[PDB]
Amino acid sequence: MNLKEQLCFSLYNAQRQVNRYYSNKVFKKYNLTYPQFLVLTILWDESPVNVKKVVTELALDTGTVSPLLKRMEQVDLIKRERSEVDQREVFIHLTDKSETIRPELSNASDKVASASSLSQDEVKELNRLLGKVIHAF
């Protein structure tokens, strides 16, 4: 069969590739992991943010979020803060270390698009199709 025609292989590999790249080009210089990277991405866009947003923007399950963020805190990448008004609410803050990394990975979703000869219309459609895959369940 044609595996280029196999979405299962296409998705797996696309992501796999993009992670591979970044893992070498940057992640190691700072000891990051793709998801951690995504979190910072969210934080670089929004100074302090509610943990619930991280859980939303990523395929996070129960008690998978808390751990991830705990690790990032241990490594001074983010600072967590629990509300005094409702103690089950938690916010996330950028740290200076994570503020530093900003210039290196903030442009990411495009270093990609450019390195993939993807047009403005193509990217919009890719994200569109991927969207369908995402909510597909």
Next chain:
Amino acid sequence: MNLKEQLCFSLYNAQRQVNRYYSNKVFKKYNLTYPQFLVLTILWDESPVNVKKVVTELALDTGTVSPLLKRMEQVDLIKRERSEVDQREVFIHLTDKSETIRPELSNASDKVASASSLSQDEVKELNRLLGKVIHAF
């Protein structure tokens, strides 16, 4: 910003989702992992195959293949065979256990496409765009 517009998030999540689904719907019934699944996918299409093909169809690095296949062997999912003609050549065979799973996951790349309301043309383009992302480096 719009994260739906963020390829980085789109790719990550798409795959993440598709794996999530299958991990629950099937993988557990047999104790599989996405890549292992991909390998079987290749084997279901080709009775015995050269390990080099697995390394090719997946983003496999050095000594990442050997381990993966070793595990699959330990669990009677595949049977490895080393050539007597050139001892660094190795072939992979389906086992009865893995032959059994065939009906459950052989259709996969489409259970997906269908569950994602993706047309024949859309799928072709998704795979196409993803292709660009893949060789993007």
